[PDB]
Amino acid sequence: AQRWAMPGTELPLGPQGLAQSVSTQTLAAGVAYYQIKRGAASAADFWTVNLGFYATQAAAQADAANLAAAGFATRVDASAGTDLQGKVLGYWLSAGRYATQAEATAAAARIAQATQNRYKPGTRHTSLAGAPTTGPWIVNVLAIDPSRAGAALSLALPGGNDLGAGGETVSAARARVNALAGVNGGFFTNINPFGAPLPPRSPVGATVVDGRLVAAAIGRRPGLLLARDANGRQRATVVRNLATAITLTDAQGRAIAVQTLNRPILGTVVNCGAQARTPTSEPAQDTVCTNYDDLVMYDSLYLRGGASNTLVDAGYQGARYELVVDANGAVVAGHATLGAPPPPNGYVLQGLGASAAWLQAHATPGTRLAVSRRLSADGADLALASGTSLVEAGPTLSVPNLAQSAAQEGFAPTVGGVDAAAANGNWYNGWYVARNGRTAAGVAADGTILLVEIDGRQPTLSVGTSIPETAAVMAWLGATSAVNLDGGGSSNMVVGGKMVGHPSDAVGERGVGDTLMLLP
């Protein structure tokens, strides 16, 4: 295949005819960084008062007419997208047409005062909805040709060994490992049900660092595999349908499935999937499921080995139990409290429900246990070997049937496996159809690795992309395989000491659960 290079044409963002600029910078042999700026804020986009996103046009009438009775005219704005049957996802109830966010914020406060806080509206900018727009956009691209680069792409865990804490920003990770450049990685635990200063953050999905399994597959999801080929060159592959099996056995052969590793909050499974039981075992991004028979393993990568998990789903009722296991596979101790640190090169098992009972039955010190780990991509075994790393995310972008494929991977207008909690149009409108910051990874026909970050949620700077726009950018760039990584406020890119992304959270750059770092 011909050597990958940046196209010279207009990006598939907005109408053809927008202005754009593309910069090129060589960072090292076989490594380049590009920034694309495109478009401009349109006078046809604007700020408005957001009363909410309703599942039907009728469902807003009880509030729209209600607000009209209070003196406020409103506007019903249809979603820019549909479900898999072509039905509109829902309708915003809005009021006003404002040039600035401050005006919309004042208008929202006036509705709150008048309705005695019966309505507490937000604000919304129409450029972020996923309808046709002129932008603007900022797109940041790293390209690494493993046939020419001495640099190596690495999957960096937060602080190296500090899973379960507050994550690590892209900037801090790059400083810690002296990277040439870096981006955020795959999905991670970002729920904060206990109201801590920050959520407790660990990678989720099948996660491998230098052959070591760090977290289990969510189920049915794709990822980016980094391995060494026969020439010793790095090889990136977009893999699909990742699955893991982590099996705990005693010396009599009795077995129990470990659900994952190193995840804070036992019994709670954000993104659902195979680790979840209620309401579904299908993947469902950002949906919070439970497993009240949970079993999670904690090791030296969790809280630097100083402690294991201490949190349990607040809805769980029943027994809890923990086993501490040494490097030889022998039980050291069992007890009904959670949080003991692992022994050197050992681990801690924590269980609820039937898993708690299984662990307590093996609590005698000296009891011999073994853990086996298997990883596969679309049924084919992937060896957990030195030199192999893996990050899971999704959806796969390089497919002809994006909405249907993404739904099968757990990014759907309805929560998979729930009988028609099933409705999911509000989430899907906001995550898939509407524009957000994004990060994505792809591979060109010649093997060049492409890492892409798109700034979002900022109407004067970069509006971000829908999932279909993200897929279009990756195909335009020349990635013949491509997968969406974590987005929204997680998305950022750094080049040397320079932050080239523009994180979208009001509080600034987000600590994330793993990063992709280009090591010199």
Short mmCIF file of C-alpha atoms in Angstrom, two decimals:
data_model
loop_
_atom_site.label_atom_id
_atom_site.label_comp_id
_atom_site.label_asym_id
_atom_site.label_seq_id
_atom_site.Cartn_x
_atom_site.Cartn_y
_atom_site.Cartn_z
CA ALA A 1 0.00 0.00 0.00
CA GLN A 2 1.08 3.59 -0.65
CA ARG A 3 2.39 5.52 2.34
CA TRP A 4 -0.39 7.20 4.30
CA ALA A 5 -0.44 10.98 4.13
CA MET A 6 -2.87 13.71 5.18
CA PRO A 7 -5.50 14.45 2.51
CA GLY A 8 -5.58 17.92 1.00
CA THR A 9 -9.33 18.12 0.49
CA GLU A 10 -12.08 19.58 2.70
CA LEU A 11 -13.10 17.62 5.76
CA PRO A 12 -16.60 16.04 5.73
CA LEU A 13 -17.72 18.44 8.48
CA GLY A 14 -20.33 20.99 7.52
CA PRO A 15 -21.06 22.05 3.96
CA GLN A 16 -18.41 22.03 1.31
CA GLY A 17 -17.17 25.60 0.97
CA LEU A 18 -16.22 26.39 4.57
CA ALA A 19 -12.78 27.86 5.20
CA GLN A 20 -10.20 25.56 6.71
CA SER A 21 -6.55 25.34 7.68
CA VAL A 22 -4.39 22.22 8.11
CA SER A 23 -1.00 22.30 9.81
CA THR A 24 1.71 19.61 9.65
CA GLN A 25 4.55 19.10 12.17
CA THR A 26 7.05 16.25 12.38
CA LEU A 27 7.60 15.13 15.99
CA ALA A 28 10.07 12.30 15.32
CA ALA A 29 10.94 9.79 12.62
CA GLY A 30 7.63 8.43 11.36
CA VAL A 31 5.57 10.65 13.69
CA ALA A 32 3.56 13.71 12.72
CA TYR A 33 1.03 16.02 14.35
CA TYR A 34 -1.69 17.92 12.47
CA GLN A 35 -4.29 20.48 13.49
CA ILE A 36 -7.34 21.16 11.33
CA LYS A 37 -9.44 24.26 11.95
CA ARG A 38 -12.62 24.45 9.92
CA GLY A 39 -15.67 26.64 9.62
CA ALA A 40 -17.19 29.40 11.70
CA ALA A 41 -20.07 30.07 14.06
CA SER A 42 -23.26 30.46 11.99
CA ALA A 43 -25.78 33.23 12.58
CA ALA A 44 -28.42 30.53 12.02
CA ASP A 45 -27.32 28.77 15.25
CA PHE A 46 -28.14 30.32 18.61
CA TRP A 47 -28.61 29.98 22.36
CA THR A 48 -31.98 29.02 23.79
CA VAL A 49 -33.62 28.14 27.10
CA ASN A 50 -33.74 24.36 27.50
CA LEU A 51 -36.80 23.02 29.30
CA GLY A 52 -35.88 19.42 28.49
CA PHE A 53 -35.76 16.60 25.95
CA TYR A 54 -39.11 14.81 25.80
CA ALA A 55 -39.79 11.37 24.34
CA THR A 56 -42.81 12.58 22.34
CA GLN A 57 -44.28 15.83 21.08
CA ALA A 58 -47.35 15.25 23.26
CA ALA A 59 -45.21 14.65 26.36
CA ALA A 60 -44.12 18.30 26.29
CA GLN A 61 -47.65 19.73 26.06
CA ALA A 62 -48.31 19.26 29.79
CA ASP A 63 -45.29 21.54 30.32
CA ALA A 64 -45.48 23.77 27.23
CA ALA A 65 -49.11 24.74 27.82
CA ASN A 66 -48.24 24.88 31.52
CA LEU A 67 -45.50 27.41 30.75
CA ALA A 68 -47.84 29.33 28.44
CA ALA A 69 -50.25 29.63 31.37
CA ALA A 70 -47.32 31.27 33.20
CA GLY A 71 -46.74 33.78 30.38
CA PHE A 72 -43.85 32.11 28.52
CA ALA A 73 -43.97 31.20 24.85
CA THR A 74 -42.06 28.07 23.85
CA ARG A 75 -40.78 26.18 20.82
CA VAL A 76 -40.68 22.44 20.12
CA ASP A 77 -37.38 21.44 18.42
CA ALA A 78 -37.19 17.91 17.01
CA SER A 79 -34.14 15.75 17.60
CA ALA A 80 -31.71 15.67 14.71
CA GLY A 81 -31.82 11.85 14.72
CA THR A 82 -34.00 8.76 14.89
CA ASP A 83 -34.10 5.30 16.44
CA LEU A 84 -33.35 2.18 14.40
CA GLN A 85 -36.89 2.25 12.94
CA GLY A 86 -36.56 5.83 11.69
CA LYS A 87 -38.75 7.29 14.44
CA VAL A 88 -37.68 10.69 15.79
CA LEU A 89 -35.84 10.25 19.08
CA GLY A 90 -37.66 13.05 20.87
CA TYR A 91 -38.26 16.77 21.11
CA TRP A 92 -36.65 19.62 22.99
CA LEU A 93 -38.90 22.16 24.64
CA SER A 94 -37.18 25.52 24.24
CA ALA A 95 -37.80 29.23 24.66
CA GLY A 96 -36.17 32.22 23.00
CA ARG A 97 -33.48 32.85 20.39
CA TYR A 98 -30.37 34.46 21.87
CA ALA A 99 -26.96 35.43 20.55
CA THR A 100 -25.15 34.66 23.84
CA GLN A 101 -25.36 32.08 26.62
CA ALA A 102 -25.67 34.80 29.25
CA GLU A 103 -28.97 35.95 27.72
CA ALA A 104 -30.34 32.40 27.72
CA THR A 105 -29.18 31.95 31.32
CA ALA A 106 -31.02 35.11 32.37
CA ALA A 107 -34.14 33.90 30.57
CA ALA A 108 -33.93 30.51 32.30
CA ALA A 109 -33.68 32.20 35.70
CA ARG A 110 -36.77 34.28 34.91
CA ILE A 111 -38.80 31.13 34.22
CA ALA A 112 -37.47 29.62 37.46
CA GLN A 113 -38.47 32.67 39.52
CA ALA A 114 -41.91 32.94 37.91
CA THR A 115 -42.75 29.24 38.22
CA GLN A 116 -41.46 29.16 41.83
CA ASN A 117 -38.74 26.71 40.72
CA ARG A 118 -41.34 24.25 39.39
CA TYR A 119 -39.26 24.63 36.21
CA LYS A 120 -35.47 24.87 36.59
CA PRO A 121 -34.39 25.18 32.94
CA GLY A 122 -30.90 24.98 31.51
CA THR A 123 -29.44 26.48 28.34
CA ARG A 124 -28.61 24.91 25.00
CA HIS A 125 -26.81 25.99 21.84
CA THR A 126 -28.38 24.72 18.62
CA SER A 127 -25.01 24.04 16.94
CA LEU A 128 -24.49 21.08 19.28
CA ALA A 129 -27.68 19.22 18.37
CA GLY A 130 -26.26 17.35 15.36
CA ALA A 131 -28.17 19.18 12.62
CA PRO A 132 -26.29 20.74 9.66
CA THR A 133 -23.94 23.46 10.86
CA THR A 134 -20.94 25.51 9.81
CA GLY A 135 -19.03 24.72 13.02
CA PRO A 136 -16.42 25.78 13.91
CA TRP A 137 -14.31 22.65 14.51
CA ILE A 138 -10.83 21.93 15.84
CA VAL A 139 -9.51 18.46 14.90
CA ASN A 140 -6.14 17.23 16.26
CA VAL A 141 -4.39 14.29 14.57
CA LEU A 142 -1.37 12.18 15.49
CA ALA A 143 0.00 9.82 12.84
CA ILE A 144 2.55 7.12 13.70
CA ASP A 145 4.06 4.96 10.95
CA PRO A 146 5.43 1.86 12.75
CA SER A 147 7.55 1.02 9.68
CA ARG A 148 9.57 4.21 10.23
CA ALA A 149 9.06 5.19 13.88
CA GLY A 150 11.34 4.31 16.75
CA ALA A 151 8.63 5.72 19.00
CA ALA A 152 6.12 3.25 20.44
CA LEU A 153 2.48 3.80 21.34
CA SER A 154 1.83 2.72 24.93
CA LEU A 155 -1.30 2.23 27.04
CA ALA A 156 -0.65 4.13 30.28
CA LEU A 157 -2.67 3.39 33.40
CA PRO A 158 -3.48 6.23 35.86
CA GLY A 159 -0.31 6.90 37.80
CA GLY A 160 1.02 3.56 36.54
CA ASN A 161 -0.59 1.68 39.43
CA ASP A 162 -3.28 3.99 40.90
CA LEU A 163 -6.55 2.55 39.62
CA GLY A 164 -9.60 3.40 41.72
CA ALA A 165 -8.42 6.95 42.53
CA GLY A 166 -9.13 10.19 40.65
CA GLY A 167 -7.71 9.18 37.28
CA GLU A 168 -4.86 10.87 35.47
CA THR A 169 -5.08 13.71 32.97
CA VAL A 170 -3.53 13.44 29.53
CA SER A 171 -1.11 16.25 30.48
CA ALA A 172 -0.04 14.59 33.73
CA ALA A 173 0.44 11.20 32.07
CA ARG A 174 2.58 12.73 29.36
CA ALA A 175 4.77 14.41 31.98
CA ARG A 176 5.01 11.22 34.04
CA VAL A 177 6.26 9.09 31.13
CA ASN A 178 8.08 11.77 29.04
CA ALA A 179 5.83 11.11 26.05
CA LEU A 180 6.18 12.82 22.69
CA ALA A 181 2.40 13.21 22.58
CA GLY A 182 -0.68 11.57 23.92
CA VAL A 183 -4.46 11.30 23.98
CA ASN A 184 -7.04 9.93 26.36
CA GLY A 185 -7.94 6.24 26.08
CA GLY A 186 -11.04 4.06 26.45
CA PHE A 187 -13.99 4.07 28.79
CA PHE A 188 -13.55 4.09 32.55
CA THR A 189 -15.68 4.21 35.69
CA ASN A 190 -16.84 7.83 36.06
CA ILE A 191 -19.92 7.56 38.27
CA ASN A 192 -19.80 9.25 41.69
CA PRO A 193 -22.77 7.90 43.67
CA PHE A 194 -21.08 8.53 47.02
CA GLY A 195 -20.40 12.21 46.32
CA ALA A 196 -16.63 12.07 46.68
CA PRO A 197 -14.53 15.01 45.39
CA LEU A 198 -13.91 12.95 42.25
CA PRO A 199 -15.38 9.70 40.97
CA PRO A 200 -13.29 6.59 41.63
CA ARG A 201 -11.77 5.86 38.23
CA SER A 202 -10.58 2.59 36.67
CA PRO A 203 -10.50 1.45 33.03
CA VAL A 204 -13.39 -0.76 32.00
CA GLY A 205 -13.63 -3.08 29.05
CA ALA A 206 -10.94 -5.55 28.10
CA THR A 207 -7.72 -3.80 29.12
CA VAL A 208 -4.25 -5.30 28.69
CA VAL A 209 -0.88 -3.65 29.42
CA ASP A 210 2.21 -5.61 28.30
CA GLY A 211 0.35 -8.92 28.51
CA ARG A 212 -1.21 -8.20 31.92
CA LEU A 213 -5.02 -8.25 32.08
CA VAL A 214 -6.19 -5.14 33.94
CA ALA A 215 -10.00 -5.26 33.49
CA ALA A 216 -12.56 -7.56 31.88
CA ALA A 217 -14.52 -7.14 28.66
CA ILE A 218 -17.81 -5.26 28.93
CA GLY A 219 -19.29 -7.51 26.24
CA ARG A 220 -19.67 -7.34 22.43
CA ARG A 221 -17.32 -4.34 22.18
CA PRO A 222 -14.37 -3.38 19.96
CA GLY A 223 -10.97 -2.03 20.81
CA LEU A 224 -7.48 -1.14 19.71
CA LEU A 225 -4.91 -3.94 19.90
CA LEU A 226 -1.20 -3.03 19.99
CA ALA A 227 1.21 -5.90 19.41
CA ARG A 228 4.62 -6.69 17.95
CA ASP A 229 4.79 -8.29 14.51
CA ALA A 230 7.48 -10.69 13.26
CA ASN A 231 9.82 -7.80 12.33
CA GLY A 232 9.49 -6.45 15.88
CA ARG A 233 7.44 -3.52 14.58
CA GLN A 234 4.41 -2.28 16.44
CA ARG A 235 1.17 -3.36 14.77
CA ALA A 236 -2.20 -1.80 15.57
CA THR A 237 -5.44 -3.63 14.86
CA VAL A 238 -9.01 -2.54 15.40
CA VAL A 239 -10.52 -5.70 16.91
CA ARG A 240 -14.18 -6.51 17.42
CA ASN A 241 -16.41 -8.44 19.81
CA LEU A 242 -13.95 -8.67 22.70
CA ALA A 243 -14.63 -11.29 25.37
CA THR A 244 -12.82 -12.38 28.52
CA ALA A 245 -13.13 -15.25 30.94
CA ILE A 246 -11.55 -14.96 34.39
CA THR A 247 -12.13 -18.20 36.28
CA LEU A 248 -11.35 -18.81 39.95
CA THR A 249 -10.90 -22.47 40.94
CA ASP A 250 -10.08 -24.44 44.04
CA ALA A 251 -8.00 -27.61 44.18
CA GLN A 252 -11.12 -29.76 43.90
CA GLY A 253 -12.04 -28.07 40.60
CA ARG A 254 -15.00 -26.03 41.87
CA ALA A 255 -15.13 -22.87 39.78
CA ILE A 256 -16.63 -19.39 39.92
CA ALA A 257 -16.52 -16.59 37.37
CA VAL A 258 -14.63 -13.46 38.38
CA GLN A 259 -16.55 -10.57 36.86
CA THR A 260 -13.70 -8.08 36.45
CA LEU A 261 -10.54 -6.71 38.03
CA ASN A 262 -9.72 -3.47 39.81
CA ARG A 263 -13.17 -1.81 39.53
CA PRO A 264 -14.39 0.49 42.32
CA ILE A 265 -17.88 -0.10 43.77
CA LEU A 266 -18.66 -3.79 44.12
CA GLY A 267 -22.10 -4.68 42.72
CA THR A 268 -22.37 -1.63 40.42
CA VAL A 269 -21.76 -2.09 36.69
CA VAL A 270 -21.86 1.13 34.66
CA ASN A 271 -22.21 0.23 30.93
CA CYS A 272 -23.99 -3.05 31.89
CA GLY A 273 -22.79 -5.99 29.76
CA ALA A 274 -21.68 -9.48 30.76
CA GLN A 275 -20.64 -8.36 34.26
CA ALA A 276 -24.18 -7.11 34.94
CA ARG A 277 -27.37 -8.97 35.82
CA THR A 278 -30.11 -6.35 36.36
CA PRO A 279 -31.84 -5.03 34.29
CA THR A 280 -29.73 -6.56 31.52
CA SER A 281 -26.53 -8.38 30.64
CA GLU A 282 -26.26 -6.62 27.27
CA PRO A 283 -23.86 -3.67 26.95
CA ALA A 284 -25.54 -0.28 27.35
CA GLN A 285 -23.20 2.70 27.50
CA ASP A 286 -23.62 4.93 30.61
CA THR A 287 -26.56 2.82 31.87
CA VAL A 288 -26.01 1.72 35.47
CA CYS A 289 -26.70 -1.96 36.07
CA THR A 290 -26.13 -4.13 39.13
CA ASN A 291 -24.75 -7.59 39.93
CA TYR A 292 -25.69 -8.60 43.47
CA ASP A 293 -23.64 -11.82 43.09
CA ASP A 294 -20.59 -9.77 42.13
CA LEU A 295 -17.00 -11.04 42.33
CA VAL A 296 -14.10 -8.67 41.64
CA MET A 297 -10.34 -9.21 41.95
CA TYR A 298 -7.98 -6.43 43.14
CA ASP A 299 -4.22 -6.40 42.79
CA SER A 300 -1.09 -4.19 42.88
CA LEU A 301 -2.51 -1.86 40.23
CA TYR A 302 -5.43 -0.75 42.44
CA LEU A 303 -4.64 2.22 44.76
CA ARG A 304 -0.93 1.31 44.41
CA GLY A 305 -1.58 -1.91 46.33
CA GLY A 306 -2.24 0.08 49.50
CA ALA A 307 -5.90 -0.99 49.72
CA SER A 308 -8.54 -2.82 47.72
CA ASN A 309 -12.09 -1.60 47.04
CA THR A 310 -14.17 -0.37 49.98
CA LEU A 311 -17.46 0.61 48.29
CA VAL A 312 -20.63 -1.41 47.66
CA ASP A 313 -23.71 -0.57 45.59
CA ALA A 314 -26.08 1.20 48.00
CA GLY A 315 -29.03 -0.93 46.88
CA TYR A 316 -27.34 -4.22 47.76
CA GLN A 317 -28.65 -6.07 50.80
CA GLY A 318 -26.79 -9.08 52.06
CA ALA A 319 -23.42 -10.45 53.00
CA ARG A 320 -20.01 -9.26 51.85
CA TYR A 321 -16.79 -11.22 51.98
CA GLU A 322 -13.13 -10.84 51.00
CA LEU A 323 -10.25 -13.30 50.57
CA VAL A 324 -6.61 -12.24 50.59
CA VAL A 325 -4.44 -14.52 48.43
CA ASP A 326 -0.63 -14.69 48.30
CA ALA A 327 1.74 -15.02 45.36
CA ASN A 328 1.67 -18.82 45.62
CA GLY A 329 -2.12 -18.95 45.31
CA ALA A 330 -2.67 -19.71 48.98
CA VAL A 331 -5.38 -17.99 51.01
CA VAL A 332 -3.89 -15.76 53.70
CA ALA A 333 -7.10 -14.57 55.35
CA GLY A 334 -10.81 -14.19 54.85
CA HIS A 335 -13.16 -11.73 56.52
CA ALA A 336 -16.52 -10.02 56.07
CA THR A 337 -15.08 -6.49 55.61
CA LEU A 338 -13.84 -5.07 52.31
CA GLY A 339 -10.61 -3.25 51.59
CA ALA A 340 -7.57 -5.23 52.70
CA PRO A 341 -4.42 -4.68 50.62
CA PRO A 342 -3.03 -7.48 48.42
CA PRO A 343 0.10 -9.38 49.50
CA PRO A 344 3.21 -8.94 47.33
CA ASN A 345 2.38 -10.31 43.87
CA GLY A 346 -0.95 -11.47 45.31
CA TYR A 347 -4.51 -10.30 45.07
CA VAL A 348 -7.78 -9.73 46.92
CA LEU A 349 -11.14 -11.25 45.98
CA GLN A 350 -14.35 -9.46 47.00
CA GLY A 351 -17.80 -11.01 46.65
CA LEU A 352 -21.52 -10.38 47.15
CA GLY A 353 -24.38 -12.84 47.26
CA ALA A 354 -23.45 -16.31 46.07
CA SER A 355 -19.87 -15.15 45.48
CA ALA A 356 -19.53 -14.05 49.11
CA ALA A 357 -20.67 -17.51 50.14
CA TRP A 358 -18.18 -19.21 47.81
CA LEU A 359 -15.33 -17.08 49.19
CA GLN A 360 -16.24 -17.71 52.83
CA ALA A 361 -16.24 -21.47 52.12
CA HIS A 362 -12.58 -21.10 51.05
CA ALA A 363 -11.40 -18.88 53.93
CA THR A 364 -9.19 -21.42 55.72
CA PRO A 365 -5.59 -20.15 55.49
CA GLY A 366 -3.55 -22.22 53.07
CA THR A 367 -6.50 -23.03 50.80
CA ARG A 368 -5.09 -23.28 47.27
CA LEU A 369 -6.74 -21.18 44.55
CA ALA A 370 -5.96 -20.52 40.90
CA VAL A 371 -7.15 -17.87 38.45
CA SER A 372 -7.17 -18.49 34.71
CA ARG A 373 -7.49 -15.67 32.17
CA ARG A 374 -8.67 -15.96 28.57
CA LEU A 375 -9.14 -13.17 26.03
CA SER A 376 -10.69 -13.36 22.57
CA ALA A 377 -11.71 -11.09 19.70
CA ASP A 378 -14.68 -12.33 17.66
CA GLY A 379 -14.08 -15.87 18.92
CA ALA A 380 -10.33 -15.96 18.16
CA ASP A 381 -8.02 -16.29 21.15
CA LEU A 382 -5.67 -13.36 21.82
CA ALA A 383 -2.62 -14.42 23.80
CA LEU A 384 -2.02 -12.47 27.02
CA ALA A 385 1.62 -12.13 26.06
CA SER A 386 4.39 -9.64 26.77
CA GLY A 387 4.40 -6.94 24.14
CA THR A 388 0.60 -6.97 23.73
CA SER A 389 -1.66 -4.15 24.94
CA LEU A 390 -5.36 -3.57 24.42
CA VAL A 391 -7.94 -0.88 25.15
CA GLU A 392 -11.67 -1.37 24.67
CA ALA A 393 -14.17 1.32 23.74
CA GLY A 394 -16.57 1.74 20.81
CA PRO A 395 -18.49 1.86 18.66
CA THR A 396 -16.63 0.55 15.64
CA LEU A 397 -16.72 3.40 13.12
CA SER A 398 -15.49 1.64 9.96
CA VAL A 399 -18.73 -0.19 9.15
CA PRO A 400 -21.38 0.31 6.47
CA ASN A 401 -24.34 0.07 8.88
CA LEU A 402 -23.18 2.34 11.68
CA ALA A 403 -26.35 2.75 13.76
CA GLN A 404 -27.22 -0.94 13.65
CA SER A 405 -23.64 -2.04 14.34
CA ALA A 406 -23.25 0.47 17.17
CA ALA A 407 -26.51 -0.74 18.68
CA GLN A 408 -25.24 -4.33 18.66
CA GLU A 409 -22.11 -3.09 20.50
CA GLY A 410 -24.20 -1.41 23.18
CA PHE A 411 -24.71 2.16 21.94
CA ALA A 412 -28.42 2.00 21.16
CA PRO A 413 -31.71 3.96 21.23
CA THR A 414 -33.14 1.33 23.62
CA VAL A 415 -31.36 -0.51 26.42
CA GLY A 416 -30.44 -3.90 24.97
CA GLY A 417 -32.04 -6.96 26.53
CA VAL A 418 -34.77 -5.00 28.35
CA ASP A 419 -38.37 -5.87 27.47
CA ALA A 420 -40.11 -3.06 25.61
CA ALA A 421 -36.19 1.22 31.54
CA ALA A 422 -36.04 0.04 27.92
CA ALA A 423 -36.38 3.50 26.34
CA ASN A 424 -33.03 5.19 25.80
CA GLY A 425 -33.74 8.02 23.37
CA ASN A 426 -32.66 10.80 25.72
CA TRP A 427 -29.21 9.27 26.25
CA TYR A 428 -28.87 8.28 22.59
CA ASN A 429 -29.84 11.72 21.34
CA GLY A 430 -27.22 13.30 23.58
CA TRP A 431 -24.40 10.78 23.07
CA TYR A 432 -24.73 9.52 19.48
CA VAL A 433 -26.73 12.10 17.54
CA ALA A 434 -25.60 15.32 19.23
CA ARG A 435 -22.12 16.77 19.05
CA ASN A 436 -19.53 16.05 21.73
CA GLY A 437 -15.81 16.06 22.11
CA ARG A 438 -14.44 12.81 20.70
CA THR A 439 -11.30 10.71 20.56
CA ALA A 440 -10.86 7.92 18.02
CA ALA A 441 -8.20 5.53 16.76
CA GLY A 442 -7.72 4.05 13.33
CA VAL A 443 -5.30 2.25 11.04
CA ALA A 444 -4.49 3.15 7.45
CA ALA A 445 -4.04 0.62 4.65
CA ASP A 446 -0.25 0.83 5.08
CA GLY A 447 -0.41 0.27 8.84
CA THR A 448 -0.03 3.90 9.88
CA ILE A 449 -1.74 4.46 13.24
CA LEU A 450 -4.03 7.50 13.42
CA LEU A 451 -5.13 9.03 16.72
CA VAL A 452 -7.76 11.73 16.41
CA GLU A 453 -9.17 14.14 18.97
CA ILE A 454 -12.01 16.57 18.23
CA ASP A 455 -12.77 19.39 20.67
CA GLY A 456 -16.45 19.77 21.55
CA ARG A 457 -19.29 21.51 23.38
CA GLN A 458 -17.81 24.97 22.67
CA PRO A 459 -19.91 26.94 20.16
CA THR A 460 -17.30 29.66 19.55
CA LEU A 461 -14.30 27.32 19.38
CA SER A 462 -15.28 23.76 18.41
CA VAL A 463 -18.75 22.24 18.31
CA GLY A 464 -17.59 18.62 18.34
CA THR A 465 -19.01 15.77 16.27
CA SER A 466 -21.85 13.30 16.24
CA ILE A 467 -20.90 9.62 16.04
CA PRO A 468 -21.64 9.59 12.27
CA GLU A 469 -19.50 12.72 11.78
CA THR A 470 -16.67 11.06 13.72
CA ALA A 471 -16.86 8.01 11.46
CA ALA A 472 -16.84 10.28 8.40
CA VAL A 473 -13.71 12.10 9.62
CA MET A 474 -11.88 8.82 10.20
CA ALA A 475 -12.78 7.50 6.74
CA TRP A 476 -11.80 10.81 5.11
CA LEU A 477 -8.47 10.77 6.94
CA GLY A 478 -7.67 7.38 5.42
CA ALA A 479 -8.32 5.06 8.34
CA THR A 480 -9.68 1.90 6.75
CA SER A 481 -10.43 0.54 10.23
CA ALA A 482 -11.46 2.85 13.04
CA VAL A 483 -12.94 2.75 16.54
CA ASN A 484 -14.40 5.49 18.74
CA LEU A 485 -12.52 5.93 22.04
CA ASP A 486 -13.80 7.83 25.08
CA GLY A 487 -15.18 11.30 24.35
CA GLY A 488 -16.97 14.23 25.91
CA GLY A 489 -14.95 15.92 28.63
CA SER A 490 -12.49 13.03 28.59
CA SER A 491 -11.14 14.00 25.19
CA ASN A 492 -7.81 15.81 25.00
CA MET A 493 -4.50 15.72 23.15
CA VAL A 494 -1.06 16.98 24.19
CA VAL A 495 2.04 17.45 22.04
CA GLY A 496 5.14 17.72 24.17
CA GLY A 497 4.45 20.21 26.91
CA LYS A 498 1.66 21.85 24.87
CA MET A 499 -2.02 21.11 25.31
CA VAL A 500 -3.45 21.15 21.79
CA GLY A 501 -6.93 19.99 22.70
CA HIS A 502 -9.47 22.14 24.53
CA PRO A 503 -11.13 20.06 27.26
CA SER A 504 -14.88 20.64 27.42
CA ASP A 505 -15.58 20.29 31.18
CA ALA A 506 -16.13 23.61 32.95
CA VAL A 507 -13.57 22.53 35.57
CA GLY A 508 -10.92 21.85 32.92
CA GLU A 509 -8.92 18.81 31.87
CA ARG A 510 -10.47 15.57 33.13
CA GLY A 511 -8.62 12.81 34.94
CA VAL A 512 -9.24 9.65 32.93
CA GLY A 513 -8.80 5.91 33.41
CA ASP A 514 -6.03 5.27 30.86
CA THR A 515 -4.23 7.19 28.18
CA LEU A 516 -2.45 6.45 24.91
CA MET A 517 1.10 7.79 25.17
CA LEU A 518 3.61 7.92 22.33
CA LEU A 519 6.93 7.11 23.96
CA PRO A 520 10.13 8.42 22.30
#
